[PDB]
Bifunctional epoxide hydrolase 2 (Homo sapiens), 1092 residues
Amino acid sequence: TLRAAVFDLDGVLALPAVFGVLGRTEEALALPRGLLNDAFQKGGPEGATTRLMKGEITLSQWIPLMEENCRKCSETAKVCLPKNFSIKEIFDKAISARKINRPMLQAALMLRKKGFTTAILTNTWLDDRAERDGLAQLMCELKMHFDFLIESCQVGMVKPEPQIYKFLLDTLKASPSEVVFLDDIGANLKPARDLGMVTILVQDTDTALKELEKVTGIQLLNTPAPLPTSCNPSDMSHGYVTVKPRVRLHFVELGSGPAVCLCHGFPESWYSWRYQIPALAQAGYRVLAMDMKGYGESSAPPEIEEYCMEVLCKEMVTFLDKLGLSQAVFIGHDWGGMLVWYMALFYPERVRAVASLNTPFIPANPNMSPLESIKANPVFDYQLYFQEPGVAEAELEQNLSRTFKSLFRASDESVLSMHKVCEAGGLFVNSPEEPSLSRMVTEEEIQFYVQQFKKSGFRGPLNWYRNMERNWKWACKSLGRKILIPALMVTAEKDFVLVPQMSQHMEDWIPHLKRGHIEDCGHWTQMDKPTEVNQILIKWLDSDAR
Amino acid sequence: TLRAAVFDLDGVLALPAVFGVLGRTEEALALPRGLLNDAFQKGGPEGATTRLMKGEITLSQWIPLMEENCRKCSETAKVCLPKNFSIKEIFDKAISARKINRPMLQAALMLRKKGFTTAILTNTWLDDRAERDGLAQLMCELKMHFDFLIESCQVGMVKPEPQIYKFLLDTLKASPSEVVFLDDIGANLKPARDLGMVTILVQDTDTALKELEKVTGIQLLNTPAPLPTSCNPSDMSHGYVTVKPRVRLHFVELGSGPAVCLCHGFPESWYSWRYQIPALAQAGYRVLAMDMKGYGESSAPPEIEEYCMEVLCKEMVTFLDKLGLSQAVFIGHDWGGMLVWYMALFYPERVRAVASLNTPFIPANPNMSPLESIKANPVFDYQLYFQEPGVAEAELEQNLSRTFKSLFRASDESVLSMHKVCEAGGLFVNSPEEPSLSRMVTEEEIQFYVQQFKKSGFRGPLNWYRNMERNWKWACKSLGRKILIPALMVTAEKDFVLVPQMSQHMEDWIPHLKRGHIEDCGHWTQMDKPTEVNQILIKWLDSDAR
């Protein structure tokens, strides 16, 4: 019964194989067949390339040794190397072209999900070229999906020496019979086979995957498109900034590049962006996912007026000042989306670009209080229930597990009616005490939210709804303005509270507004349609905020 | 007795005054005198510009209103505006040219140091231009040096309306008689004077500063060059990353741009980089100043082998992986400098550039143990005293205040002999029990270190010295390599432990090595010569790591 799978990097997880570029270079330059491959292997175990793979010398020290090897090989073949011959140019282009073999990585992720331990065993070098960042980025993307990464140049051993396979089995804590080994080079399989390992010679990916399926008993080919990579909270960098004496904000950070601030809604957490954080960082952005004021590890003062938009926006500006960021792209959802439109209206100099998921920009009505406007819409009755301090808190804190299981559901799985909440006496008065787990979340994901809300409670979160008149008064100062910076509005078809029709007149205030629309998507946009959200945000960021 | 000073931004703290660019534009374009200034003030309190300064409209909404004003003014003057006339091009260039008036900012910093409360009171706009980041960066640099920043467009009031001066006095909690008010516009002084404030009309900076000196009694002009801006620990963003089950690393973060990791020495803290962190962030870098393993808020496991270079470097790579950084510039001092040379030797792909303060790169000697090498130099006798677990800890933890006051001294203030430490029985056996405070540090700065070392103790820090044989064995694997990435070595003339002569053969291993040398500088380089360190690092970063 197999329990571990070992993959090679070159020719298996990354294509095209850098070793195969020498074959295509000889053809293009009309050089004798196998000339560059001979210079590459020249010397065997004592040759320059073996020393490179063992970590004795770096890639830049090896380039002039391979150049000499090319000249010595050409003199024996009775041929001359071209005028523009450069080993550095050949290897720079070969390393740059190599992309991740997606079906192979997907098969490794599936095996790991099914309980297998996965590893990369590769003959690689210490890259000190001016272009070494390209290799570093590739290694980082692959690294997070594997339990172990054993690089020849770090252990001082190379394939096919039998000692590297013994070191591998020692690291894996497994017998050779429980290990599948995938390599594109025949010579590298012989030692794994001599020990008794199941070996797969990888020539083309699909045949290698059919062999892997047959030997593991798991379907790898023709399987559905997987969900985006999620966050493990304990693997994140956690940041803490004091913006005022009693107020500290917690955030999670990943990536480098332009700052992108993610602002969650009610009653959520930074964890609601778990599918976006790795994708946006991989796209080349530095992601800061906040615990908004009143939530998780951020401060939760009890005073209502501590959660009016004016105070909230001012603290967000101070957050940027203390981090030393002159600007950030602001992306919000639900209450966070309401906040990012007001950041664009009051502090445009600090906002690189503004994006809102579900929440439309609706300008304040000076002739009508927001309270009277809430009576006009029966779906907004739950907001009147949230007004009296203590009432909605007691119901929502009564059983946290029930609260989050009833709220976090796909549009067709809904168990709550947002109408006559006040008349019914509560939000959950007509709901089951033990709701079923939605297909959108796992029990482990639900438990993260109950842990976060055990410390804080719902007072801070509910206070965001208890400043309607103060927010209205403050918003009325911006009625003469327009939003003229890059802006994106994303509507969710099945959000029956923040319906797409509420955003139809936004172009009057934000004339160059860009749009996104997600079909069959409810209120919890990020966890309902994570792949679609990532695609719409990355496309917009790369064009409007870069 | 004056206790508050209020400064205007345009024409006072930032020059040239954006209002004065209209005068130079009329001259250059041969337009009638005062034509552009008339279009600018057209309408008075009800005109486009007053609405812009009140925050009613944004800068981009105001540009077409000023354009129309320019055309209406030209028709009355019987003149025609040029073919290439653009208000946007004029204002873009005017805002871009405006730099900080250094002598004025220095005078404000001096007044604040002498107990004054300082504020900026300015008529400004909501900038939504594609170039608004330039204004945002300027505002951020000025912001941190003032107690209050009151912007017209945020309060809905403008100078010279008397209500803005009443709002100012309310914010300052001071009587008009205790306030100095500096403005370049005569009209803006009249209301401050009517209330009884001391006013200074700023035409040229030096005369305004002579008036400010005469009225405050403090010398502002001809005063020495001030020290760089330092960090207040409670104003920093604190980050925490778990790199392995028992190991968490703390770091402080500021700025945006390429990642720069600062690694302190023994027995220090992230706080040792207090003068570099704001300067490097202002230069356009994202600074991560670590508490190295064993120090401050980072984990301090008791095991000796938890502090060997191999383990330390591996955890630093994991630190980059968890933050989502493919590369960082590594800058070290003392033990941190020793670590950054080994990061360059073993992980070149993760290191953008490497810099060391005081610590030279000395390659391992395979024919001689590091223990025998330490006997050959009498100044390295203190390292043999640090070997036995428990001995140096008891002396260093006995009185923390004495430990840091005896260690942190300028080269001429030394109170310790590094020779015959073992024979004498200790490091402080011939030292005063109550040493005087060095001119290099304040009592408050010393107390930060005693607070940090109260939690940790000296076991983790001293364990960095207790892996000589293991580090030697590991370093011997890199003897065939060279450092071929951008590298900087900075020597300190008066460091009598890490003398500049110890770095003389570094070019054999790092052929393209750049150098820096600081005269009259002891061991504590960062706090001894902060301005010189900042200048050498920023110059090198901008050319080699950008």
Notes: Chain B has 24 helices and 15 strands.
